[PDB]
Ligand binder design. Sequence first.
Ligand SMILES: OC[C@H]1O[C@H](OC[C@H]2O[C@H](O[C@H]3[C@H](O)[C@@H](O)[C@@H](O)O[C@@H]3CO)[C@H](O)[C@@H](O)[C@@H]2O)[C@H](O)[C@@H](O)[C@@H]1O
Ligand SMILES: OC[C@H]1O[C@H](OC[C@H]2O[C@H](O[C@H]3[C@H](O)[C@@H](O)[C@@H](O)O[C@@H]3CO)[C@H](O)[C@@H](O)[C@@H]2O)[C@H](O)[C@@H](O)[C@@H]1O
Ligand SMILES: OC[C@H]1O[C@H](OC[C@H]2O[C@H](O[C@H]3[C@H](O)[C@@H](O)[C@H](O)O[C@@H]3CO)[C@H](O)[C@@H](O)[C@@H]2O)[C@H](O)[C@@H](O)[C@@H]1O
Ligand SMILES: OC[C@H]1O[C@H](OC[C@H]2O[C@H](O[C@H]3[C@H](O)[C@@H](O)[C@H](O)O[C@@H]3CO)[C@H](O)[C@@H](O)[C@@H]2O)[C@H](O)[C@@H](O)[C@@H]1O
Ligand SMILES: [Ca+2]
Lengths: 450, 442
Amino acid sequence: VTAPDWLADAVFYQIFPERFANADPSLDPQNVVPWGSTPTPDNFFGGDLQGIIDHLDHIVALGANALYLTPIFEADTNHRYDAKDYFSIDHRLGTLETFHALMAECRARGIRIVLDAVLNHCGDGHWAFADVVENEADSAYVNWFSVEGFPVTAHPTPNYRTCSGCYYLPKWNAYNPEVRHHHLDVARYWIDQGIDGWRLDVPYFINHTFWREFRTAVKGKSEDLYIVAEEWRSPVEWLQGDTADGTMNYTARDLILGFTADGGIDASALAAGLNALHAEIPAGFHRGMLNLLGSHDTERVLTRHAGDVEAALLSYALLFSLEGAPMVYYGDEVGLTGDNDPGCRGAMPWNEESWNTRLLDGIRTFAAFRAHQPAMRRGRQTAVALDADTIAIVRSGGDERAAVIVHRGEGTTVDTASIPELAPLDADTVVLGPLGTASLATAASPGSSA
Amino acid sequence: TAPDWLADAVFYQIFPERFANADPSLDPQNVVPWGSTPTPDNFFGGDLQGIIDHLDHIVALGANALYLTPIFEADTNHRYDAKDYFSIDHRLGTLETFHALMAECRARGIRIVLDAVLNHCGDGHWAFADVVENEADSAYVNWFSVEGFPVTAHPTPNYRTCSGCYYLPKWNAYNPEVRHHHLDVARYWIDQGIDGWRLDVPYFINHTFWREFRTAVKGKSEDLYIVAEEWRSPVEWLQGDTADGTMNYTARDLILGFTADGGIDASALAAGLNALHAEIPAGFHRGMLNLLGSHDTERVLTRHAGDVEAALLSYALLFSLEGAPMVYYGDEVGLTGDNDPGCRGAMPWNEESWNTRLLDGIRTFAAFRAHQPAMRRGRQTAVALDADTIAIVRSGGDERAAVIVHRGEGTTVDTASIPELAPLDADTVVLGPLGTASLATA
Ligand SMILES: OC[C@H]1O[C@H](OC[C@H]2O[C@H](O[C@H]3[C@H](O)[C@@H](O)[C@@H](O)O[C@@H]3CO)[C@H](O)[C@@H](O)[C@@H]2O)[C@H](O)[C@@H](O)[C@@H]1O
Ligand SMILES: OC[C@H]1O[C@H](OC[C@H]2O[C@H](O[C@H]3[C@H](O)[C@@H](O)[C@@H](O)O[C@@H]3CO)[C@H](O)[C@@H](O)[C@@H]2O)[C@H](O)[C@@H](O)[C@@H]1O
Ligand SMILES: OC[C@H]1O[C@H](OC[C@H]2O[C@H](O[C@H]3[C@H](O)[C@@H](O)[C@H](O)O[C@@H]3CO)[C@H](O)[C@@H](O)[C@@H]2O)[C@H](O)[C@@H](O)[C@@H]1O
Ligand SMILES: OC[C@H]1O[C@H](OC[C@H]2O[C@H](O[C@H]3[C@H](O)[C@@H](O)[C@H](O)O[C@@H]3CO)[C@H](O)[C@@H](O)[C@@H]2O)[C@H](O)[C@@H](O)[C@@H]1O
Ligand SMILES: [Ca+2]
């Protein structure tokens, strides 16, 4: 089966909930740092779920109708990939009630919620793992993990399987039916609590049999539940109809940034790469691709562009033009900067004198265009290099067409005649300024059903 | 009628004391460093060789005509106090340098309009100094309006001047001898190769004189351009007997009202531009010299309080208009300054001190105009789409163009609603915050 239809109309906003908005400082830990502080692998700022709720207007005004939240279950770190209880919201984020309140406010606003499924590993603080450290071969949980022997040690190197050699992330034994049962109950439990899908953390470290079983458990609750795989390389293995509905499209990230920030690839090579990527994605999964320019595991877009906001805007035009659901990383829309993790996990400033609001408005415009034109959501995609510095992303539905034209040089003209996919447009020539974009579509009119 | 070539023109205004100093041997002894604050009294040593040396800049902007502020021998840095109308100012160069500038301009297809300062001359001019000295016995006593002798500036001048200023004695244009001198100035520089004259404070003289002036200039050649300085309605100058057009200070005020001040909205801008258009007679639209700033105003970017994107809106509108657009030296690279003397800063030639994206934006608007024939000869219609959004539609014989300018936070334009454009265009077009879009259709 294919990606749910609603993905075609989605626009995602990615939130790292430690850092979004601190609405309830009674939930703050003892050594919470000031909100403007430099992020580190160890510090806590107090972001909470009530802060998400309180800022839904910002998210909707951006043009997003879906959230992707990084992990929110009880954990010991600020990133919460080291979960200790998969059936509890972390105590610093809030309670189950607050979570319920976010899901309800989201439903009321037509916002969907995707959570992070961290199934390959848990934290060393997890009850099961703590029980194995204490009770060893007599623990009921000994084979929920891959412990070489006793006593459990981390002191040189771990004597147990982990995420990439990290001591505090012991690897779940997914070959144990009891672990798979726990894992599927997590899936099912949060779906019962109102979520609309799951993003699969490091799914390439588990195995496809398990991911097939996960699909059946999720899609059995509802076929409109979205599953999206983290995948940094070719997405193709995830799109066979038996695992995910799409991947995080890091392929398109690298292509786009190669052109707009690095200067390493020209428009021909960008066009070729995006068309080839498109052709490799099976029919029915293009809409399920989760397109992005950055995340909590990359430097921030504006830092990749060395502070060139106009160049950054070319990446956003491209992002919003592509088939698949575009996703903005929280604070990128107001021009936050940062190097790679932890640098990109800065706290979101809510004092609007610190925002680049021309950047914000640029992105809103792209989003609004996409929201208004059916072809930008459901059209086939063709990328067309016009010259080394200029690319057209054409989205076509029937005889209808939308075009986002992206120019990284000092100005140009585009003859829409003599570029065949651009043919139905009435404009015969369109100018582009320095680092300019132009967005055009054929006259569209909603058709009457009676 | 205005000469046809004005339709394809794009002017670059130079205040020659400040453009480029190529020849240090012409610098005065009191010459200040090129980075200095401009003042009513200081000289920076700009010269004509400096102009010649940067002609490639002017061409690369997309300009093909120069308006020079006065260049004749004078005692001030602005040179409106001419002391000899038949000589280039010694600090600027020689008649040979001027010839060379004309020839290098011709080679590149650049026309030259000079400033005609006929209402008054400087107190240093030979005729006026002859009057101070020889008084009633001077042959030139009636070339001026001197009340009595001895001539004095001291409390107030005892002679007629430009607006009370003692070093700008008023020429007596009622004297046939003076008119003869004036007409000989006009003729002389046309014989040296110029393409037209800009008229300084033409409202201080009289239309009779200005009709004699047109007859003398057009008699040399019908294609020589005459443009009046006029800050209010241009219509007196457009009856076919004086100028080919004016400096379009009306459209300056309307455009900046919308893009910089926020006092006028798109509907008012449109209406004002369509009315201006309707008031300008047929044959004279092309002759209007459109501008956003001059040596007599604050710099466009200062009017915009440093908002480069807002400024770019002003240039989009400027270059869309019927009439010849004019860029004021250094605005293209984003020089700032208050009004005179603050708008008369030295032009920087280090490319790292330029706002090159501003430069490139302007170049783009220029290129579009240069490429599309309707942007030069097409009928003009302005239409407001929104309080913040305006379309300037130019209609050619075989092609229509629109420049859409938005001063808001972003919008969508249904091209079927601009009915001037809409019989061969139903595309929708997006505009970003402070965005423009430029399109053409066969
Ligand atoms: O192979 C993954 C990584 O494991 C160790 O680093 C621990 C990191 O844990 C988190 O990283 C998650 C990402 O944010 C996810 O989006 C995805 O890639 O999966 C990982 C693990 O769940 C945490 O967010 C990071 O701050 C930690 O560095 C190794 O030390 C790394 O070398 C490995 O690449
Ligand atoms: O009436 C005009 C003005 O006269 C006196 O100021 C002397 C100014 O002389 C020059 O200004 C000229 C402009 O730059 C021209 O483009 C046009 O407007 O004509 C005038 C006079 O030839 C000089 O460039 C300026 O720096 C001087 O101020 C009065 O003092 C002013 O109040 C009058 O408005
Ligand atoms: O998630 C944190 C991490 O993200 C990036 O690294 C991604 C990812 O790269 C490798 O994984 C590859 C697997 O080894 C292959 O078997 C699989 O086919 O393709 C994946 C990627 O899709 C690493 O092996 C893995 O540890 C890591 O998650 C950043 O590059 C990295 O610096 C971050 O630490
Ligand atoms: O020229 C420098 C000067 O420029 C501006 O002033 C222009 C101009 O304005 C007035 O002239 C008007 C006449 O009085 C009217 O009779 C005529 O119809 O219209 C003109 C305007 O076109 C002043 O009288 C005149 O002295 C001046 O040149 C700036 O406002 C001014 O501050 C500058 O000094
Ligand atoms: Ca000099």
